[PDB]
Amino acid sequence: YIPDYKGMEPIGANIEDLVDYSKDWLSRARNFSFFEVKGTAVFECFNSNEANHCQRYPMSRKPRNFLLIQCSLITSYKPATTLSDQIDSRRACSYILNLIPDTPASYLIHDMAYRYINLTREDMINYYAPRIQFKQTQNVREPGTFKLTSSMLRAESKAMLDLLNNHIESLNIASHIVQSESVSLITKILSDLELNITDTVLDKFFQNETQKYLIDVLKKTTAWHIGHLIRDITESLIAHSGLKRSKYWSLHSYNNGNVILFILPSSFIRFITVFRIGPGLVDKDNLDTILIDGDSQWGVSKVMSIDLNRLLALNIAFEKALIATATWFQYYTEDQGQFPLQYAIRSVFANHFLLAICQKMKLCAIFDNLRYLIPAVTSLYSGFPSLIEKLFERPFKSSLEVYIYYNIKSLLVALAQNNVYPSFMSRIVYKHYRSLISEVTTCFFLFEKGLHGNMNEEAKIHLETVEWALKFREKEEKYGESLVENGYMMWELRANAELAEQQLYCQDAIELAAIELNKVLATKSSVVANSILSKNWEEPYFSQTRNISLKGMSGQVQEDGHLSSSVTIIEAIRYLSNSRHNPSLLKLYEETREQKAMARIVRKYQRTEADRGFFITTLPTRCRLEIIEDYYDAIAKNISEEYISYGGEKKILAIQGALEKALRWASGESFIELSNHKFIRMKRKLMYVSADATKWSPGDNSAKFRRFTSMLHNGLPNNKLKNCVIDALKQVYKTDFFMSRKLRNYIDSMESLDPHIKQFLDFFPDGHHGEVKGNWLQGNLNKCSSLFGVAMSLLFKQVWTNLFPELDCFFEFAHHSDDALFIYGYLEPVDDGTDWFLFVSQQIQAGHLHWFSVNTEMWKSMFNLHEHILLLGSIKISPKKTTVSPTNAEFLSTFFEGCAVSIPFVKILLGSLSDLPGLGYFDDLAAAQSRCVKALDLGASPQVAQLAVALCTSKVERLYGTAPGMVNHPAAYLQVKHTDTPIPLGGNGAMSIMELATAGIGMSDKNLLKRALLGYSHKRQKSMLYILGLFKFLMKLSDETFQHERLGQFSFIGKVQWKIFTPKSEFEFADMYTSKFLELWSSQHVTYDYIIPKGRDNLLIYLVRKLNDPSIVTAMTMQSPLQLRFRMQAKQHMKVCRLDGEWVTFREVLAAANSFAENYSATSQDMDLFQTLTSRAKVARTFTVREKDQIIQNSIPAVIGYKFAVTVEEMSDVLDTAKFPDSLSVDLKTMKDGVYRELGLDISLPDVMKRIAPMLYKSSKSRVVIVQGNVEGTAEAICRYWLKSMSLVKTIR
C-alpha cells in the first residue's frame, strides 16, 4: 500500500529563456575564480601571509615544548627486565643523590630518589613483585609504586606540587632568526636520530631486499634504540596509569641508570625524565634544568602531563615509524626502480620517528592541508592563495612546526617554479607525482585519530552549522520564506542578479536540468522502473543489516531537554518493543511522518567503526533519508556506464568514455565559415577541471530536489512512489539541531562571552536546540546530489550548445563519489589570430554580444558559465580545492581517491598496531593478521605486509606474554613445540602473509589437526595424540556456534574464553531476555544463525541476543576511556581466562591443557568430529575464495537457512530472504552434491552441516584486491600476481 501524497505540477520552463540569460550574462566581463600558478605568486602569497600573521598575533620569544619524552642514547639499548630495572634504579639514584638541585622540580627529583634509596628490603621485594604475589607494606601500598608523604618533601617540592595541582601566542615566523633557530634545533635532533649507535619462497626475497636494505640499515640507528627505550618508558607509564596505582609515586631506570623516570601521583599521568645529556631527543631550552657533576651533565625535564591516547601513540611510535619507512621504501622502489641509499632511508626513518613521537593537532592539520597544496601548485590554475592562507589559521608554537612550515614553503615554491618532483623528506627527486603525494599521505597518517574530536573541533562544527542556519534565516527574512523554499523564478533572477547565490535555487533551472536528464533516462524507462521496484519497498524495515547496525543515532528528548546519543540497534529494539509488527519502509514512514527531524553531534566517547561524519539523526529522519536514497540510487544506477561510476565493471567506463571522447575530438581540426566557402581553421585543445562538486555543503538547500524528483522520469505508471519521495524530502526540510552537554558546559564555564558566542547562544532560545532549514546535516543524500549535479552539468552542456551552434566546442564530465572531472574542449586560432578576432567583432556588431566572452580564453568562459549554471541549482564549486590543468596528473588520482577501495594501505598497516578488540589472544592476533591481509589486498607489497605481520604478532605476544622466554610461553607448560601449539593456546600460526591471504587466518589450526590425525591414525604416535588431546581440551573449554553478526574471529576447533570489559551500566534492553532463554532460543533456532528474522518477536529476541554478544558490547564501547585503558593493561599476570567456572591466569589454562592432553584417549566420535572439522594501471579485480556453483541461484545463507528451517516462521523468513524462493530445494541438492564432491561429507548426517556451514558462508563472501596489470577475477590469477610481486625491484615470472 502507498498513500496519496501531493506532488508538484510542471511550471512553464523554456530553455530559450535560460539561453537568453546566458547571452546577457556572457556579454560582460566575469572574474575567473582561480589564479595562475607561478613561483613568484606562491612566494608572495607566503610572504604576505607571514606579514599578516605576525601582526595579528602576540609574538613570543620562547618556543614551546614539542618532545613529550626527552632522553639520549650512546650505546645499544637492551630491553628492560624486572631484574635490570632494580639495578639501574639503585645506581641511578646513587648518581642523582650526588647532585645539587636548583629548581623545585629538581628538588622533587632529589626527594623521590632519596625516598627510593631508603626503602626496606621487603619494600624492594614487594615493589617488583607481581600483583598475584604482592603484599602490602607500610611504604609500598601498590606494586611498582611507593608512598611519599608531605613530611619527606622539602619546601621547594611542596611548592612545585602546589603549583601543579592548583592550576594564544605565536612565534615570529616572518623573522629569519626564529627560522634559523628552529631549523638548527630540528636538524640537530634529526642528525642525532640518524647517527649509528655504538624456508618460504618469500623469505629469500625478504632477506635479500627488505632485511638487507631496510632492516639491516635502520637496526644500527639511534632512532631504533630510542624507539625501544620509549616503548619501555611508555610501558612503565601505562602500568602506573592504573586506577589503584596512579595515586602513588613511582621510579624506574633504564639504560644502565642513564635514564630515570619519576612518576607523580596522577585523566592525565604526570612524570619527569632525568637523563644524561648526549645525542638523542634533547631540547636543552625546554628542559627544567641541567645539573653538573663534573664532566657529566644531567638534564631534568619539566613535569610532563600525558593522556592515554598520546601514551598509546608513543608506545607504538617505533612500529609506526618503521611501517611508514617501509611504505616509503616500497614507493621508492616502485618509482625509481631500485633501492634507496642508506642515508635517504635513515633520514626518512628519523623524520617518521620524530613525527610519530610528536602528536600535535597543528602538525596533523599542516600535513592534511599539504595534500591539497601539492596539487594546487603543480597545475596551471588553482586556488592556492586560499590553501596557503589556511596554513596560518593556527599559531606556530614549537620549533618543529616552524621547521615543517619552512620545508613546506621551500617545497611548494620549488614545485610552482617547475611548471621531476622534489621529495619532502629527503634529497631525492621523484619521477612521478603519485610518489610525492604518497609521501605526504604517509606522513599525514602518522597522526592518530584519537586527537581529533577535542573540545575545539566540535565547537567549530557547531558554530559552522549555526552560522549557515542564521544566513538561511537572513535570506528568508529578506526574500520571503516561500521564495527561499520553493525557489525563485527566472524573471526574478533577470531582475535581481543577487538571487543567484548559494542556499537559493531557480525553479526553472531545476526543471530544465530534470528535462535534460530525462532526455537520456527515457530510453531506459523499463530498466529504471524495474530497478526502482527491486528496492523492496515492502520488505520489513528492521530486518536489514543497515537498520540494526552499531552506527550512532539520536535517541529521545530527555527530561533535562537534550537529545540522547544512542545506537541504531537500541532504537530498533525500542521501536519493536512498543510495536506489534515489523513495518516496511513506507509503513514506518507513514507512522512517523508527523515527527520533526532532529539531529545532534555524535559523542566522541560513543563513536564506532560504522560511524561516518559528525551528525546523528533520529529514526524518522533516517527512514526519510533511506526512502530518498533507495529511490535515487535505483534511478542513478542506469547512467552508471555514462556519468557516475559505482563499482566493479562500471567503475571505470565513465572516465574511459569521457577521456577517450576528449582525445578523439582533440585529434581533429575545426573550420568556421566567416563568409562564402572561405573558412577559418582552429586548433582543438582540452582543459581539465577537477572539483568536489557533489560533496555535501552545510550551505545547501534540500528543497531543490523536490521539484527535481517531481520532474525526473522514473518509468513507473503512477506517481505514488514519486510523491512519497517528494513528501519525504518535504519532511526533512526543518530539523531541530541540539547542542552537546559538553559544549553547554564549556560555554557556561567561560566568564567572558565572545560576540560570536553570544549569537551562537541566541540561536538556541531554550538552551538546547534550534531550528535549521535547508541543510540536511550530512544526511545520506549522496546519489540524489550526484544525479542532480549530472543533470545540472547536462543543462549547462545544452545551454552552451545553443549559445554557439557554429562552434564545435566540446564538453564531457564524470562523477565519482564527491569528485567530478570536467573536460572542456575549446578552440584556439592557428598561426596568428587575426581572422578570428575579425570574425568575433563582426559577430558582436551583428548583435551577438555573447561573443565578447569567446574572444580569448574560451575555456575560461565555458567554466564561468558552467559554474554559474551550477550555482543556479545552489551548487558552489569550491574556490580552494578545485584544480585546473591542461593535462590529467592530479585528476586521475583525486578522482578515484575517496572510494572504499582506493584507500591507501598505509592507514590499514598503521591501524593494525592499535584498536585491537581486546577479546583474547587468539581474537587479537586474528584481528591484527586480518588487517595486514587487507592491507596486502589494498596494494601493500608482500614484504611490507610481512614486516607488518611480524610487528603486530610481536606486539600481541608481548601484550599477552606468550613470546619465548616470557611468563605464558606455551613451550614451558606444554609437551609440544611453539609451532605445534594451537593458536588459542598461545601459538602464533603460519606467520606468512602469502598463506594468511590465500588459505585463511584459522586454517593453521586445521592443518595442525590434519597432521595430528594422519600421524595418530597411521603410527599411533604419543605426541600426535597429545596434540589431539590439546584440541579436544580447547573444544571442551568453548565450542560456540557461528553467528553471522558476531564481529570476532570464529574458531572451528575450540577457543579459550577471556574476560571482557564490563561497562558501568549495561546497554538498554540488554536485560529484556535472560541468558538461559537466549541460549535455548539459539539452540532451537539454527536458521537464525544465517538469516535475520522477519517477524517482530523473533527479531526482538535476535536483536536482544545480538546486544548481549561479547564482540558487540566490545565494539559499542570501543572509544570508552575505561575500555581503552583496559586494553592497554598487560594480561601477562592477570586472571582473565575462564577455567572450571573461575577466572585464572593463562599459564594455569596451559597447565590444565597439558594435564588433559597427557591423560587423553581417542574415541570414535572424537575421530569422526576431528575428520569432519578438517576437510602500470591499478584496477580493483574482485575474486572469491572458492566461487559459487552456477547452479546455485540463491545466496549461501539462504540455502543454509532453508536447510535448517523447521518452524513455519523460520521457513517464511527463509522464503522472504531468498531472492528465488521457488528454486530452493534445487540449490540444496546442488550444495549437498558439491559438499560430497569436494569435502567428501554428507550434510544430511547429523551435526555435519552445523560444523561445515561456516566454511561455506566464508566461501560465499568476496574480496576486492588492487592488482597492477592484466590480472583476471579468478583467485588463481590473483595468487600468481602476488607471487610475481614478491620481489620489489626485479620481475620473478
Author numbering: 226 to 392, 402 to 432, 448 to 515, 523 to 675, 700 to 1455, 1483 to 1600
Direct quotes from the study:
The polymerase is a multifunctional enzyme that contains an N-terminal His+ endonuclease, a RNA-dependent RNA polymerase (RdRp), and a presumed cap binding domain (CBD) at the C-terminus. The viral polymerase carries out both transcription (production of viral mRNA) and replication (production of genomic RNA). Here we establish the expression and purification of the polymerase from the Old World Hantaan virus and characterise the structure using Cryo-EM.
From this dataset, we were able to determine the structure of the polymerase in two conformations comprising either only the polymerase core (residues 226–1600) or with the core and the endonuclease ordered (residues 1–1600) to resolutions of 2.8 Å and 3.24 Å, respectively. In our RNA free model motif F is positioned such that it would block the RNA template entry channel. In our RNA-free HTNV structures we observed the loop 921-EEYIS-925 in a retracted conformation. This retracted conformation is similar to that observed for LACV polymerase pre-initiation conformation, RNA-free DBV, or RNA-free Lassa virus polymerase structures.
